[PDB]
Symmetry: C3
Subunit: 89 residues, 3 copies
């Protein structure tokens, strides 16, 4: 029926990130005040959720990507996407 | 099969907005501290996500409404819902 | 197909809560800076969304749990999960 999205934003501009699960893969579109561009995030998933927080001006993002019942956390902490410690049980 | 929701909130009261995709249409329920009422947002979609931010006391909301793989951004900036610049590619 | 999740976070640590709808039930995993543990939230639902806000250091969470077209709001205000006033229509 349809793609599934998750969105987060931060700061005053703001920056926005929209994650889209489509056909088994999640990709990312980004707005930093001037226009939309494709982000670095690209991971398997049929479902996605996201949360983010600032430490000063530094953004931290957590993306929860699920296939089946297997949910992987992906972390942005300023220097690339890394696999997080999240486990579902 | 079940309806799909997205939620955002802001301020200290807080205000809450809950968007529900049901049978191809997304509608909005709103809480501003006293009770729930039906909001102005009404757009096609099978899937919904949302983010929001304050500029001072002014709320800005972005709702991402998807059908198929077609995602439309809807913007609240204080003066009605407008179509945003978001594109998926 | 897959499980469906919703996530929220607050504060500087931060605390994170991830809600997962799986096979008709929503459960909660929690991070408070040291590790992940299973939270108190456990309610029926095929779909979940969440929002939260701080009042000072006190967290308030609202989880919207849906089955069919019936959405129930669950509230955390420091003293257990309670059913909220949310209704989907008049």
């Amino acid at each position: 029926s349809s793609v599934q999205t998750a969105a987060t934003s931060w700061g005053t501009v703001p920056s926005i990130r929209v994650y889209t699960a489509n056909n088994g893969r999640i990709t990312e579109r980004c707005w930093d005040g001037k226009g939309w561009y494709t982000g670095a995030f690209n991971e398997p998933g049929d479902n996605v959720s996201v949360t983010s927080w600032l430490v000063g001006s530094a953004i931290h993002i957590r993306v929860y990507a699920s296939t089946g019942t297997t949910t992987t956390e992906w972390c942005w902490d300023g220097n690339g996407w890394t696999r997080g410690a999240y486990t579902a049980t």
